[PDB]
């Protein structure tokens, strides 16, 4: 049922870049690109919450061919144009400190992707992943806790739920539940897909809540920069109340180490009703209602 490994690294699908557009507005930190690829000529199918591999050119420092890097799929199964012909990614250019042999270091695959030109051919593998899948139940509640490019799978869910063209293409999925995105980025220019997220909240105010944690523009009650963990703490009681519903799913995506402050906040909330969150959460994971993808 769920598509997986239609293409593998030994015989990847050769896609073509259609577009490569910037998502970080002026005044933002770093580069994050929305890249769309042409899937025509092959049979790559996928669903929301999955990833694909990209094999970049070149050799590593030891002379060995570069291996694939995984990227969360940014588009619904139908692609951004709802034509079942494309797939999109949301790729940050990795760049980091001097300490590691040199000065500014640039990631191999992410630099390749963020600078790729339309018309270029790329090696694609996958799709992969069954741990970030969206329920078919149109009355589910969906909590989405995203940091940075952790937004990516959330885009696939929200587009499927709320885009006019998606609703028209998906007669069996007319979302009537409640979804809540808490999205942590450093600046307003760094709010990936800001305009479309706010368009969704305006059209569906009873079915979608949008909460930002903007670290360079907002301070938590303790005086520190505002992070996703601070917003979860601020709304811990209400998030816990939603989580108790048998039909609620929670999705967490972003940098590794983001889970710890989220668990601390929810643990304090659940403890007020005599529940140990770590135990309750284990049961949610087993039931397929607690979805995590961090790296
Ligand atoms: C399932 C999954 C989904 C993913 N989804 C996305 C996504 O949607 N968007 C996205 O942009 N990325 C995503 N990634 C990350 C992606 O796979 C790559 O790891 C990322 O793009 C960097 O790869 P690169 O080839 O550019 O860097 P590489 O050339 O592979 O360099 C990475 C290496 O640099 C070093 N390094 C990294 N940071 C530092 C630091 N701060 N200080 C010192 N050394 C450091 C580490 O040793 C690391 O192994 C995802 C990863 C996984 C596993």
Q: Which neighbouring-strand residues pair with 225?
A: 219
Residue with tokens 């989405």: 144
* Spatial distance between the Cα atoms of 266 and 174, rounded to a whole number of angstroms: 30
Classify each residue of 125-147 as buried b or exposed e, where b means 16 or more C-beta atoms within 10 Å of its C-beta.
bbbbbeebbbbeeeebbbbbbbb
Quick check: CB of 33 below 6 Å from ligand 1?
A: no
Q: Is the CB of 154 under 6 A from ligand 1?
A: no
Under DSSP, the state recorded for 8 is: B
Beta strands 208-214 and 95-96, pairing class: unpaired
DSSP conformational letter for 150: G
Strands, DSSP E only, in the chain?
13-22, 32-38, 51-55, 69-72, 86-92, 95-96, 105-106, 121-128, 141-147, 179-185, 208-214, 248-254, 290-294
44 near 6, Cβ under 8 Å?
Answer: yes
Q: Is 152 in the pocket of ligand 1 (CB under 6 A)?
A: yes
Distance CA 155, CA 159 (A): 6
Helix (H) or strand (E) holding 45: none
Delineate the domains of the chain, giving CATH numbers in brackets. 1-128 (2.40.30.10), 129-295 (3.40.50.80)
Q: How far is CA 26 from the centre of its chain?
A: 22
Nearest 5°: phi and psi at 287? -85, -10
Q: Is the distance from the beta carbon of residue 74 to the nearest atom of ligand 1 less than 6 Å?
A: no
Of the candidates 117, 17, 107, 3, the residue with the CA atom closest to the CA atom of residue 52? 3
**274, two tokens:** 């005599």
159 Cβ contact partners less than 8 Å away, ≥ 6 residues apart: 75, 76, 166
Q: What's the reported resolution, in angstroms, to a tenth?
A: 1.9
Give the C-alpha distances (Å, rounded to integers) separating 237 from 120, 219, 234, 254, 271: 49, 20, 8, 23, 10
> What's the CA gap between 158 and 194, in Å, rounded?
13
Which residues pair with residue 250 across a beta bridge? 143, 290
The verdict on the CB of residue 181 being under 6 Å from ligand 1 is no
Q: Does any ligand 1 atom lie closer than 6 A to the CB of residue 100?
A: yes
In sequence order, which ranges of 86-235 are alpha helices (DSSP H)? 108-114, 151-162, 164-169, 194-203, 228-234
Give CA–CA dist 289/134, Å, rounded. Answer: 9
How far is Cα of residue 198 from the mean position of the Cα atoms in its chain?
A: 17
Residue having the nearest C-alpha atom to atom 21 of ligand 1: 110
Residue nearest to ligand 1 atom 48, measured at CA: 107
With contact defined as beta carbons under 8 Å apart, do 130 and 51 qualify?
no
List alpha helices for the chain, DSSP H: 108-114, 151-162, 164-169, 194-203, 228-234, 236-243, 259-271, 277-287
Q: Going by C-beta distance under 8 Å and a sequence separation of 6 or more, which residues neighbour residue 210? A: 181, 183, 197, 198, 200, 201
The residue contributing the CA closest to ligand 1 atom 1 is 70
- Mutation to probe ligand 1, out of 74, 94, 251 (largest number of atoms < 8 A from CB): 94
The rounded Å distance from CA 293 to ligand 1 centre is: 13
Distance CA 15, CA 123 (A): 6
């Amino acid at each position: 049922d769920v598509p997986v490994n239609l293409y593998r690294p030994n015989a990847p699908f050769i896609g073509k870049v259609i577009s490569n557009e910037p998502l970080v507005k002026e005044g933002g930190i770093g580069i994050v690109q929305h890249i769309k690829f042409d899937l025509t000529g092959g049979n790559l199918k996928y669903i929301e919450g999955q990833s694909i591999g990209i094999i970049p050119p070149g050799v590593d420092k030891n002379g060995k061919p570069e291996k694939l890097r995984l990227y969360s799929i940014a588009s619904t199964r139908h692609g951004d144009d709802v034509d079942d012909k494309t797939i999109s990614l949301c790729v940050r250019q990795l760049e980091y400190k001097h300490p590691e042999s040199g000065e500014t270091v640039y990631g191999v695959c992410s630099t390749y992707l963020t600078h790729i030109e339309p018309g270029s051919e790329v090696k694609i593998t996958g799709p992969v992943g069954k741990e970030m899948l969206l329920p078919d139940d149109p009355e589910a509640n969906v909590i989405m806790l995203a940091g940075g490019t952790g937004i990516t799978p959330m885009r696939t869910y929200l587009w499927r739920m709320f885009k006019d063209a998606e609703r028209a293409a998906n007669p069996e999925y007319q979302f009537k539940g409640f979804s809540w995105l808490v999205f942590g980025v450093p600046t307003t220019p760094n709010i990936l897909y800001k305009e479309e997220l706010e368009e969704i909240q305006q059209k569906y105010p009873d079915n979608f809540r949008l909460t930002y944690a903007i670290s360079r523009e907002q301070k938590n009650p303790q005086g520190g920069r505002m992070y996703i963990q601070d917003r979860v703490a601020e709304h811990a009681d209400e998030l816990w109340q939603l989580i108790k519903n048998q039909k609620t799913h929670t999705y967490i995506c972003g940098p590794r180490g983001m889970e710890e402050g989220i668990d601390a906040a929810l643990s304090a909330a659940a403890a007020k009703e005599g529940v140990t969150w770590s135990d309750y959460q284990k049961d949610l994971k087993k039931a397929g209602r607690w979805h995590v993808e961090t790296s």
